[PDB]
C-alpha cells in the first residue's frame, strides 16, 4: 500500500496519495495535467527519515532539501510522465538513470586553467552563433592536484571531439569516461 | 585580481565585483547589510566553466545549478560574514568545512526499515514535546543491501546516543563515523 513519488521521492501510503496528493509536487502535477497516482511508484528502496531538510547533507544529495520533512526513498523505479518532465529542466531521474557523464581529457601540463578559460569562452561564442540546437557541453573543469587533464561534462564522446577540434594543448584522442566511483574523489573541495 | 564569491562560488575580477557586485547573491548581501567584496575571497581552487547549470551534474553537486552560467570555483577559502549566514539555512561552506557527519549504527538484522519508521516517529514526537532547542538529528536511513545497520546523520555521537536510548534492536554502543570516501557508495541509487 506504500508508494513513492518519482519526482520528490516522498513515501506515503496509496490512501495518502489518493486523499492528499503529493505535499511537494502537487502544483507541478496540476500544471502538467497528470494525476498524482501515475507519478508515484510501488517499487522503491532506501528509506530515509528526513527530519531537517534544510540542514541535512543526505537531503542535499537526494534533492529533498527544499521538500517537507517526512519519509523519502533513495531509489524510485519508474518513468515520470513526459508532461511533467517537460516542465522541469532541473529534473534528474530517481531510478539511477540520466546520470553524470564526465570525460577526463589529456592536455598539456600547465595549461589546465588556461584551457577552462578558453573553452568557456568558446562555448559562449558558439551559443551566440548557432541556432536552436547548441553543442551539449554542460561544464568543463580542472583540479590543481590533477595535472595534465581537463574534465568535460557532455553526454557523448562525439560532442567533446567536435568542441575541442582545432584547440591547441588539448589531447582529444586521449580521453576516458570517468567511472562513477571516481567522481567523488574528483570534485571534493579538499584533495589529498 | 580574480576573486571568488564565498556564497555562490562565482569567479570574477575584483573590478567586476566592484562594478556589478555578485550576479547571483546581491539581493542577499543587500538584505544582510554587507558589501560584495567582503563576501568574496582571493583564495580559490578548481576552475569550473559552467555552461548549462540546470542540466549539469557538476552544477548540482556544487550548488550552482540555480545560479547563472559563468566561471565558478570548487573550493573557496574564507568565512562568510555572520549576517549573511543567519539568513540562509541552506548555506553550506565552500571551503570543505561544515561537512556530512553520518554514523553507521549496528542494529538487529531484519529490523532496519522498521527502525527508520520508529525513529522518524520518535523525532517527530520529540519536536512536538520539546522547546526551542531540538535534538540535532538531521536524518536517518537504511539500505537493503547493507543489513544489520542503520545510518544516522547528526553532528555529535552524544546526540545519537540520547536519541537511541531505550529503543529496542538498536545496538547504540557499536557505531562508526562513516569516512567521507565511503559516503558515495552509501547513497548511490543502485548498489552492487
Ligand atoms: Zn512529489
Ligand atoms: Zn555570489
mmCIF file of C-alpha atoms and ligand atoms in Angstrom:
data_model
loop_
_atom_site.group_PDB
_atom_site.id
_atom_site.type_symbol
_atom_site.label_atom_id
_atom_site.label_comp_id
_atom_site.label_asym_id
_atom_site.label_seq_id
_atom_site.Cartn_x
_atom_site.Cartn_y
_atom_site.Cartn_z
ATOM 1 C CA UNK A 1 0.000 0.000 0.000
ATOM 2 C CA UNK A 2 3.053 2.278 0.196
ATOM 3 C CA UNK A 3 4.213 4.214 -2.872
ATOM 4 C CA UNK A 4 6.995 6.719 -3.596
ATOM 5 C CA UNK A 5 6.722 9.918 -5.649
ATOM 6 C CA UNK A 6 9.007 9.716 -8.696
ATOM 7 C CA UNK A 7 9.610 13.491 -8.643
ATOM 8 C CA UNK A 8 10.370 14.313 -4.981
ATOM 9 C CA UNK A 9 10.975 10.792 -3.600
ATOM 10 C CA UNK A 10 8.423 11.056 -0.761
ATOM 11 C CA UNK A 11 6.951 7.839 0.631
ATOM 12 C CA UNK A 12 3.258 7.780 1.572
ATOM 13 C CA UNK A 13 0.509 5.171 1.601
ATOM 14 C CA UNK A 14 -1.678 4.776 -1.502
ATOM 15 C CA UNK A 15 -4.548 6.159 0.614
ATOM 16 C CA UNK A 16 -2.500 9.273 1.472
ATOM 17 C CA UNK A 17 -1.562 9.983 -2.161
ATOM 18 C CA UNK A 18 -5.249 9.397 -3.037
ATOM 19 C CA UNK A 19 -6.534 11.756 -0.336
ATOM 20 C CA UNK A 20 -3.918 14.483 -0.244
ATOM 21 C CA UNK A 21 -1.828 14.035 -3.394
ATOM 22 C CA UNK A 22 1.838 14.907 -3.065
ATOM 23 C CA UNK A 23 2.667 17.607 -0.476
ATOM 24 C CA UNK A 24 5.722 18.673 -2.524
ATOM 25 C CA UNK A 25 4.781 18.272 -6.200
ATOM 26 C CA UNK A 26 1.008 18.795 -6.483
ATOM 27 C CA UNK A 27 1.328 22.214 -8.179
ATOM 28 C CA UNK A 28 3.568 20.751 -10.871
ATOM 29 C CA UNK A 29 1.259 17.757 -11.428
ATOM 30 C CA UNK A 30 -1.698 20.148 -11.736
ATOM 31 C CA UNK A 31 0.133 22.213 -14.380
ATOM 32 C CA UNK A 32 1.198 19.008 -16.174
ATOM 33 C CA UNK A 33 -2.423 17.785 -16.260
ATOM 34 C CA UNK A 34 -1.485 14.466 -14.633
ATOM 35 C CA UNK A 35 -2.747 12.534 -11.608
ATOM 36 C CA UNK A 36 -0.549 12.141 -8.538
ATOM 37 C CA UNK A 37 -1.009 8.347 -8.672
ATOM 38 C CA UNK A 38 0.630 7.936 -12.085
ATOM 39 C CA UNK A 39 3.583 9.982 -10.777
ATOM 40 C CA UNK A 40 4.112 7.506 -7.914
ATOM 41 C CA UNK A 41 5.698 4.051 -7.875
ATOM 42 C CA UNK A 42 5.079 0.904 -5.776
ATOM 43 C CA UNK A 43 8.757 -0.041 -6.277
ATOM 44 C CA UNK A 44 11.344 1.825 -4.190
ATOM 45 C CA UNK A 45 14.338 1.238 -1.908
ATOM 46 C CA UNK A 46 16.355 3.035 0.769
ATOM 47 C CA UNK A 47 14.060 4.505 3.400
ATOM 48 C CA UNK A 48 15.059 7.967 4.599
ATOM 49 C CA UNK A 49 13.515 9.529 7.692
ATOM 50 C CA UNK A 50 14.093 13.176 6.737
ATOM 51 C CA UNK A 51 13.934 15.388 9.824
ATOM 52 C CA UNK A 52 15.785 18.607 8.891
ATOM 53 C CA UNK A 53 15.775 19.017 5.066
ATOM 54 C CA UNK A 54 17.413 22.480 5.053
ATOM 55 C CA UNK A 55 20.436 21.218 7.027
ATOM 56 C CA UNK A 56 20.777 17.562 6.031
ATOM 57 C CA UNK A 57 23.554 16.605 3.608
ATOM 58 C CA UNK A 58 21.532 13.464 2.817
ATOM 59 C CA UNK A 59 18.662 15.788 1.828
ATOM 60 C CA UNK A 60 21.029 17.871 -0.280
ATOM 61 C CA UNK A 61 22.363 14.825 -2.141
ATOM 62 C CA UNK A 62 18.843 13.416 -2.693
ATOM 63 C CA UNK A 63 17.339 16.789 -3.761
ATOM 64 C CA UNK A 64 14.852 16.728 -0.889
ATOM 65 C CA UNK A 65 16.442 19.750 0.830
ATOM 66 C CA UNK A 66 13.650 22.054 -0.425
ATOM 67 C CA UNK A 67 10.963 19.455 0.313
ATOM 68 C CA UNK A 68 9.000 18.809 3.526
ATOM 69 C CA UNK A 69 10.162 16.718 6.477
ATOM 70 C CA UNK A 70 8.933 13.127 6.089
ATOM 71 C CA UNK A 71 9.812 9.660 4.796
ATOM 72 C CA UNK A 72 11.689 9.514 1.480
ATOM 73 C CA UNK A 73 13.185 6.833 -0.781
ATOM 74 C CA UNK A 74 16.709 6.853 -2.219
ATOM 75 C CA UNK A 75 15.796 4.834 -5.323
ATOM 76 C CA UNK A 76 12.398 5.043 -7.009
ATOM 77 C CA UNK A 77 11.767 2.785 -10.005
ATOM 78 C CA UNK A 78 9.676 4.002 -12.913
ATOM 79 C CA UNK A 79 9.357 6.710 -15.511
ATOM 80 C CA UNK A 80 7.871 10.122 -14.748
ATOM 81 C CA UNK A 81 5.227 11.163 -17.332
ATOM 82 C CA UNK A 82 6.619 13.309 -20.176
ATOM 83 C CA UNK A 83 4.245 16.214 -19.446
ATOM 84 C CA UNK A 84 5.879 16.601 -16.015
ATOM 85 C CA UNK A 85 9.451 16.203 -17.337
ATOM 86 C CA UNK A 86 8.966 18.932 -19.997
ATOM 87 C CA UNK A 87 8.176 21.467 -17.234
ATOM 88 C CA UNK A 88 11.257 20.759 -15.117
ATOM 89 C CA UNK A 89 14.730 21.409 -16.625
ATOM 90 C CA UNK A 90 16.285 20.551 -13.244
ATOM 91 C CA UNK A 91 14.634 17.100 -13.111
ATOM 92 C CA UNK A 92 17.050 14.201 -12.706
ATOM 93 C CA UNK A 93 15.667 10.623 -12.519
ATOM 94 C CA UNK A 94 15.437 8.914 -9.119
ATOM 95 C CA UNK A 95 15.991 5.429 -10.597
ATOM 96 C CA UNK A 96 19.746 5.858 -11.257
ATOM 97 C CA UNK A 97 19.378 6.747 -14.929
ATOM 98 C CA UNK A 98 20.080 10.108 -16.615
ATOM 99 C CA UNK A 99 23.485 10.035 -14.827
ATOM 100 C CA UNK A 100 26.731 12.115 -14.665
ATOM 101 C CA UNK A 101 28.845 11.689 -17.903
ATOM 102 C CA UNK A 102 32.195 13.348 -17.286
ATOM 103 C CA UNK A 103 35.196 12.805 -19.555
ATOM 104 C CA UNK A 104 38.805 13.165 -18.449
ATOM 105 C CA UNK A 105 40.716 14.595 -21.387
ATOM 106 C CA UNK A 106 44.510 14.685 -21.501
ATOM 107 C CA UNK A 107 46.106 18.078 -22.058
ATOM 108 C CA UNK A 108 49.479 19.823 -21.881
ATOM 109 C CA UNK A 109 50.589 20.000 -18.216
ATOM 110 C CA UNK A 110 50.429 23.632 -17.046
ATOM 111 C CA UNK A 111 47.661 24.654 -19.467
ATOM 112 C CA UNK A 112 44.691 23.276 -17.487
ATOM 113 C CA UNK A 113 43.317 26.560 -16.076
ATOM 114 C CA UNK A 114 44.040 28.363 -19.333
ATOM 115 C CA UNK A 115 42.055 25.733 -21.244
ATOM 116 C CA UNK A 116 38.992 26.080 -18.985
ATOM 117 C CA UNK A 117 39.091 29.847 -19.628
ATOM 118 C CA UNK A 118 39.456 29.363 -23.399
ATOM 119 C CA UNK A 119 36.775 26.660 -23.710
ATOM 120 C CA UNK A 120 34.212 28.518 -21.578
ATOM 121 C CA UNK A 121 34.689 31.479 -23.938
ATOM 122 C CA UNK A 122 34.426 29.149 -26.964
ATOM 123 C CA UNK A 123 31.089 27.683 -25.796
ATOM 124 C CA UNK A 124 29.740 31.187 -25.080
ATOM 125 C CA UNK A 125 30.655 32.226 -28.647
ATOM 126 C CA UNK A 126 29.139 29.055 -30.140
ATOM 127 C CA UNK A 127 25.820 29.699 -28.357
ATOM 128 C CA UNK A 128 25.749 33.236 -29.786
ATOM 129 C CA UNK A 129 26.500 31.980 -33.315
ATOM 130 C CA UNK A 130 24.497 28.726 -33.509
ATOM 131 C CA UNK A 131 20.717 28.290 -33.805
ATOM 132 C CA UNK A 132 18.233 26.451 -31.565
ATOM 133 C CA UNK A 133 20.374 23.311 -31.128
ATOM 134 C CA UNK A 134 23.546 24.065 -29.143
ATOM 135 C CA UNK A 135 26.580 21.842 -28.505
ATOM 136 C CA UNK A 136 25.712 19.757 -25.456
ATOM 137 C CA UNK A 137 28.703 20.823 -23.343
ATOM 138 C CA UNK A 138 27.323 21.127 -19.804
ATOM 139 C CA UNK A 139 30.518 22.084 -17.968
ATOM 140 C CA UNK A 140 34.302 21.895 -18.038
ATOM 141 C CA UNK A 141 36.681 21.889 -15.051
ATOM 142 C CA UNK A 142 40.199 21.320 -13.712
ATOM 143 C CA UNK A 143 41.780 20.402 -10.393
ATOM 144 C CA UNK A 144 45.176 21.772 -9.391
ATOM 145 C CA UNK A 145 46.273 18.392 -7.981
ATOM 146 C CA UNK A 146 45.345 16.547 -11.200
ATOM 147 C CA UNK A 147 47.822 17.992 -13.689
ATOM 148 C CA UNK A 148 47.748 17.280 -17.429
ATOM 149 C CA UNK A 149 43.974 16.684 -17.532
ATOM 150 C CA UNK A 150 40.798 18.680 -18.005
ATOM 151 C CA UNK A 151 37.310 17.316 -17.395
ATOM 152 C CA UNK A 152 34.407 17.834 -19.770
ATOM 153 C CA UNK A 153 30.797 17.095 -18.885
ATOM 154 C CA UNK A 154 28.916 16.054 -22.033
ATOM 155 C CA UNK A 155 26.616 13.111 -22.890
ATOM 156 C CA UNK A 156 28.627 11.796 -25.850
ATOM 157 C CA UNK A 157 32.250 11.460 -26.950
ATOM 158 C CA UNK A 158 31.389 12.983 -30.366
ATOM 159 C CA UNK A 159 30.285 16.274 -28.738
ATOM 160 C CA UNK A 160 33.617 16.693 -26.910
ATOM 161 C CA UNK A 161 35.627 15.930 -30.076
ATOM 162 C CA UNK A 162 33.531 18.453 -32.026
ATOM 163 C CA UNK A 163 34.068 21.021 -29.237
ATOM 164 C CA UNK A 164 37.836 20.518 -28.822
ATOM 165 C CA UNK A 165 38.677 20.263 -32.542
ATOM 166 C CA UNK A 166 41.431 22.717 -33.501
ATOM 167 C CA UNK A 167 42.117 23.798 -29.917
ATOM 168 C CA UNK A 168 45.853 23.732 -29.024
ATOM 169 C CA UNK A 169 47.095 21.884 -25.917
ATOM 170 C CA UNK A 170 44.062 19.559 -25.760
ATOM 171 C CA UNK A 171 44.933 15.933 -26.495
ATOM 172 C CA UNK A 172 41.439 14.993 -27.638
ATOM 173 C CA UNK A 173 42.305 11.451 -28.798
ATOM 174 C CA UNK A 174 43.310 10.511 -25.244
ATOM 175 C CA UNK A 175 40.192 10.551 -23.091
ATOM 176 C CA UNK A 176 38.306 8.425 -20.579
ATOM 177 C CA UNK A 177 34.732 8.330 -19.320
ATOM 178 C CA UNK A 178 35.229 8.719 -15.560
ATOM 179 C CA UNK A 179 33.651 5.819 -13.640
ATOM 180 C CA UNK A 180 31.038 6.918 -11.080
ATOM 181 C CA UNK A 181 33.184 5.573 -8.193
ATOM 182 C CA UNK A 182 35.968 8.026 -9.155
ATOM 183 C CA UNK A 183 33.703 11.122 -9.341
ATOM 184 C CA UNK A 184 33.628 11.908 -5.577
ATOM 185 C CA UNK A 185 37.441 11.995 -5.419
ATOM 186 C CA UNK A 186 37.306 14.316 -8.438
ATOM 187 C CA UNK A 187 35.042 17.064 -7.066
ATOM 188 C CA UNK A 188 35.720 17.043 -3.294
ATOM 189 C CA UNK A 189 36.826 20.539 -2.112
ATOM 190 C CA UNK A 190 39.985 19.270 -0.369
ATOM 191 C CA UNK A 191 42.192 16.819 -2.274
ATOM 192 C CA UNK A 192 44.907 14.575 -0.767
ATOM 193 C CA UNK B 1 42.778 40.482 -9.433
ATOM 194 C CA UNK B 2 40.403 37.500 -9.571
ATOM 195 C CA UNK B 3 38.181 36.665 -6.593
ATOM 196 C CA UNK B 4 35.517 34.038 -5.859
ATOM 197 C CA UNK B 5 32.176 34.587 -4.111
ATOM 198 C CA UNK B 6 32.041 32.560 -0.883
ATOM 199 C CA UNK B 7 28.261 32.079 -1.203
ATOM 200 C CA UNK B 8 27.709 31.042 -4.847
ATOM 201 C CA UNK B 9 31.303 30.208 -5.875
ATOM 202 C CA UNK B 10 31.371 32.521 -8.923
ATOM 203 C CA UNK B 11 34.746 33.764 -10.155
ATOM 204 C CA UNK B 12 35.027 37.361 -11.383
ATOM 205 C CA UNK B 13 37.737 40.011 -11.415
ATOM 206 C CA UNK B 14 37.967 42.436 -8.477
ATOM 207 C CA UNK B 15 36.874 45.162 -10.927
ATOM 208 C CA UNK B 16 33.761 43.153 -11.874
ATOM 209 C CA UNK B 17 32.722 42.547 -8.250
ATOM 210 C CA UNK B 18 33.382 46.273 -7.629
ATOM 211 C CA UNK B 19 31.301 47.404 -10.613
ATOM 212 C CA UNK B 20 28.489 44.881 -10.722
ATOM 213 C CA UNK B 21 28.598 43.049 -7.386
ATOM 214 C CA UNK B 22 27.611 39.398 -7.490
ATOM 215 C CA UNK B 23 25.098 38.445 -10.221
ATOM 216 C CA UNK B 24 23.749 35.609 -8.029
ATOM 217 C CA UNK B 25 23.889 36.841 -4.420
ATOM 218 C CA UNK B 26 23.495 40.640 -4.488
ATOM 219 C CA UNK B 27 19.940 40.576 -3.064
ATOM 220 C CA UNK B 28 21.090 38.522 -0.088
ATOM 221 C CA UNK B 29 24.119 40.770 0.531
ATOM 222 C CA UNK B 30 21.830 43.820 0.397
ATOM 223 C CA UNK B 31 19.487 42.285 2.998
ATOM 224 C CA UNK B 32 22.492 41.270 5.134
ATOM 225 C CA UNK B 33 23.847 44.843 5.030
ATOM 226 C CA UNK B 34 27.247 43.664 3.767
ATOM 227 C CA UNK B 35 29.465 44.603 0.824
ATOM 228 C CA UNK B 36 30.017 42.143 -2.016
ATOM 229 C CA UNK B 37 33.804 42.489 -1.601
ATOM 230 C CA UNK B 38 33.872 41.129 1.955
ATOM 231 C CA UNK B 39 31.823 38.145 0.723
ATOM 232 C CA UNK B 40 34.500 37.297 -1.869
ATOM 233 C CA UNK B 41 37.881 35.600 -1.490
ATOM 234 C CA UNK B 42 41.209 35.938 -3.362
ATOM 235 C CA UNK B 43 41.964 32.286 -2.488
ATOM 236 C CA UNK B 44 40.171 29.595 -4.507
ATOM 237 C CA UNK B 45 40.821 26.403 -6.482
ATOM 238 C CA UNK B 46 39.168 24.228 -9.129
ATOM 239 C CA UNK B 47 38.008 26.342 -12.051
ATOM 240 C CA UNK B 48 34.617 25.361 -13.451
ATOM 241 C CA UNK B 49 33.373 26.691 -16.779
ATOM 242 C CA UNK B 50 29.640 26.315 -16.089
ATOM 243 C CA UNK B 51 27.694 26.287 -19.354
ATOM 244 C CA UNK B 52 24.339 24.627 -18.547
ATOM 245 C CA UNK B 53 23.622 24.972 -14.784
ATOM 246 C CA UNK B 54 20.106 23.455 -14.929
ATOM 247 C CA UNK B 55 21.402 20.237 -16.539
ATOM 248 C CA UNK B 56 24.950 19.861 -15.216
ATOM 249 C CA UNK B 57 25.597 17.268 -12.504
ATOM 250 C CA UNK B 58 28.742 19.244 -11.619
ATOM 251 C CA UNK B 59 26.460 22.261 -11.064
ATOM 252 C CA UNK B 60 24.122 20.150 -8.953
ATOM 253 C CA UNK B 61 26.953 18.876 -6.741
ATOM 254 C CA UNK B 62 28.451 22.382 -6.360
ATOM 255 C CA UNK B 63 25.065 24.081 -5.704
ATOM 256 C CA UNK B 64 25.456 26.315 -8.752
ATOM 257 C CA UNK B 65 22.522 24.686 -10.584
ATOM 258 C CA UNK B 66 20.238 27.648 -9.756
ATOM 259 C CA UNK B 67 22.992 30.176 -10.489
ATOM 260 C CA UNK B 68 23.973 31.842 -13.784
ATOM 261 C CA UNK B 69 26.248 30.368 -16.446
ATOM 262 C CA UNK B 70 29.841 31.506 -15.859
ATOM 263 C CA UNK B 71 33.155 30.625 -14.213
ATOM 264 C CA UNK B 72 32.958 29.029 -10.756
ATOM 265 C CA UNK B 73 35.386 27.641 -8.164
ATOM 266 C CA UNK B 74 35.110 24.252 -6.453
ATOM 267 C CA UNK B 75 36.906 25.355 -3.275
ATOM 268 C CA UNK B 76 36.696 28.888 -1.892
ATOM 269 C CA UNK B 77 38.728 29.693 1.221
ATOM 270 C CA UNK B 78 37.364 32.059 3.839
ATOM 271 C CA UNK B 79 34.470 32.684 6.166
ATOM 272 C CA UNK B 80 31.192 34.212 5.003
ATOM 273 C CA UNK B 81 30.051 37.096 7.268
ATOM 274 C CA UNK B 82 27.629 36.019 10.025
ATOM 275 C CA UNK B 83 24.890 38.417 8.864
ATOM 276 C CA UNK B 84 24.717 36.515 5.556
ATOM 277 C CA UNK B 85 24.864 33.055 7.191
ATOM 278 C CA UNK B 86 21.950 33.851 9.565
ATOM 279 C CA UNK B 87 19.680 34.490 6.545
ATOM 280 C CA UNK B 88 20.434 31.220 4.751
ATOM 281 C CA UNK B 89 19.528 27.909 6.475
ATOM 282 C CA UNK B 90 20.594 26.049 3.315
ATOM 283 C CA UNK B 91 24.106 27.569 3.338
ATOM 284 C CA UNK B 92 26.931 25.033 3.375
ATOM 285 C CA UNK B 93 30.564 26.277 3.377
ATOM 286 C CA UNK B 94 32.550 26.166 0.124
ATOM 287 C CA UNK B 95 35.880 25.623 1.930
ATOM 288 C CA UNK B 96 35.249 21.952 2.852
ATOM 289 C CA UNK B 97 34.082 22.656 6.396
ATOM 290 C CA UNK B 98 30.571 22.209 7.845
ATOM 291 C CA UNK B 99 30.653 18.665 6.350
ATOM 292 C CA UNK B 100 28.465 15.487 6.277
ATOM 293 C CA UNK B 101 28.544 13.639 9.700
ATOM 294 C CA UNK B 102 26.809 10.305 9.219
ATOM 295 C CA UNK B 103 27.047 7.489 11.760
ATOM 296 C CA UNK B 104 26.635 3.814 10.923
ATOM 297 C CA UNK B 105 24.897 2.205 13.876
ATOM 298 C CA UNK B 106 24.648 -1.561 14.288
ATOM 299 C CA UNK B 107 21.161 -2.993 14.687
ATOM 300 C CA UNK B 108 19.303 -6.310 14.637
ATOM 301 C CA UNK B 109 19.378 -7.717 11.071
ATOM 302 C CA UNK B 110 15.863 -7.536 9.592
ATOM 303 C CA UNK B 111 14.758 -4.542 11.688
ATOM 304 C CA UNK B 112 16.409 -1.796 9.597
ATOM 305 C CA UNK B 113 13.307 -0.438 7.809
ATOM 306 C CA UNK B 114 11.219 -0.826 10.951
ATOM 307 C CA UNK B 115 13.763 1.225 12.908
ATOM 308 C CA UNK B 116 13.721 4.098 10.388
ATOM 309 C CA UNK B 117 9.913 4.177 10.719
ATOM 310 C CA UNK B 118 10.077 4.114 14.535
ATOM 311 C CA UNK B 119 12.850 6.721 14.853
ATOM 312 C CA UNK B 120 11.274 9.155 12.373
ATOM 313 C CA UNK B 121 8.115 8.976 14.508
ATOM 314 C CA UNK B 122 10.201 9.415 17.686
ATOM 315 C CA UNK B 123 11.888 12.592 16.380
ATOM 316 C CA UNK B 124 8.510 13.990 15.266
ATOM 317 C CA UNK B 125 7.150 13.412 18.795
ATOM 318 C CA UNK B 126 10.248 14.943 20.421
ATOM 319 C CA UNK B 127 9.883 18.121 18.329
ATOM 320 C CA UNK B 128 6.248 18.428 19.445
ATOM 321 C CA UNK B 129 7.183 17.934 23.117
ATOM 322 C CA UNK B 130 10.487 19.838 23.420
ATOM 323 C CA UNK B 131 11.048 23.614 23.445
ATOM 324 C CA UNK B 132 13.159 25.838 21.174
ATOM 325 C CA UNK B 133 16.236 23.566 21.176
ATOM 326 C CA UNK B 134 15.521 20.266 19.398
ATOM 327 C CA UNK B 135 17.666 17.118 19.196
ATOM 328 C CA UNK B 136 20.023 17.658 16.272
ATOM 329 C CA UNK B 137 19.013 14.537 14.326
ATOM 330 C CA UNK B 138 19.051 15.625 10.674
ATOM 331 C CA UNK B 139 18.120 12.320 9.029
ATOM 332 C CA UNK B 140 18.152 8.551 9.419
ATOM 333 C CA UNK B 141 18.305 5.931 6.646
ATOM 334 C CA UNK B 142 18.841 2.297 5.648
ATOM 335 C CA UNK B 143 19.960 0.414 2.557
ATOM 336 C CA UNK B 144 18.542 -3.008 1.721
ATOM 337 C CA UNK B 145 21.979 -4.329 0.692
ATOM 338 C CA UNK B 146 23.593 -3.196 3.970
ATOM 339 C CA UNK B 147 21.854 -5.407 6.520
ATOM 340 C CA UNK B 148 22.264 -5.043 10.288
ATOM 341 C CA UNK B 149 22.999 -1.296 10.136
ATOM 342 C CA UNK B 150 21.099 1.974 10.182
ATOM 343 C CA UNK B 151 22.645 5.351 9.408
ATOM 344 C CA UNK B 152 22.052 8.459 11.489
ATOM 345 C CA UNK B 153 23.003 11.956 10.380
ATOM 346 C CA UNK B 154 23.861 14.058 13.441
ATOM 347 C CA UNK B 155 26.813 16.324 14.354
ATOM 348 C CA UNK B 156 27.804 14.526 17.566
ATOM 349 C CA UNK B 157 27.906 10.999 18.980
ATOM 350 C CA UNK B 158 26.147 12.193 22.176
ATOM 351 C CA UNK B 159 23.045 13.264 20.193
ATOM 352 C CA UNK B 160 22.643 9.806 18.612
ATOM 353 C CA UNK B 161 23.067 8.045 21.983
ATOM 354 C CA UNK B 162 20.481 10.378 23.539
ATOM 355 C CA UNK B 163 18.126 9.695 20.597
ATOM 356 C CA UNK B 164 18.512 5.890 20.531
ATOM 357 C CA UNK B 165 18.432 5.357 24.315
ATOM 358 C CA UNK B 166 15.800 2.775 25.285
ATOM 359 C CA UNK B 167 14.986 1.826 21.690
ATOM 360 C CA UNK B 168 14.976 -1.972 21.111
ATOM 361 C CA UNK B 169 17.018 -3.529 18.280
ATOM 362 C CA UNK B 170 19.468 -0.599 18.074
ATOM 363 C CA UNK B 171 22.984 -1.524 19.178
ATOM 364 C CA UNK B 172 23.967 2.021 20.110
ATOM 365 C CA UNK B 173 27.367 1.140 21.629
ATOM 366 C CA UNK B 174 28.550 -0.190 18.259
ATOM 367 C CA UNK B 175 28.808 2.736 15.866
ATOM 368 C CA UNK B 176 31.203 4.334 13.396
ATOM 369 C CA UNK B 177 31.541 7.785 11.864
ATOM 370 C CA UNK B 178 31.438 6.988 8.138
ATOM 371 C CA UNK B 179 34.544 8.303 6.347
ATOM 372 C CA UNK B 180 33.761 10.727 3.501
ATOM 373 C CA UNK B 181 35.248 8.303 0.920
ATOM 374 C CA UNK B 182 32.617 5.692 1.894
ATOM 375 C CA UNK B 183 29.609 8.065 1.636
ATOM 376 C CA UNK B 184 29.133 7.849 -2.174
ATOM 377 C CA UNK B 185 28.908 4.042 -2.030
ATOM 378 C CA UNK B 186 26.357 4.505 0.763
ATOM 379 C CA UNK B 187 23.821 6.735 -1.013
ATOM 380 C CA UNK B 188 24.120 5.744 -4.703
ATOM 381 C CA UNK B 189 20.690 4.658 -6.080
ATOM 382 C CA UNK B 190 21.969 1.324 -7.449
ATOM 383 C CA UNK B 191 24.169 -0.795 -5.174
ATOM 384 C CA UNK B 192 26.417 -3.700 -6.263
HETATM 385 ZN ZN1 LIG C 1 6.292 14.513 -5.057
HETATM 386 ZN ZN1 LIG C 2 27.665 35.116 -5.119
#
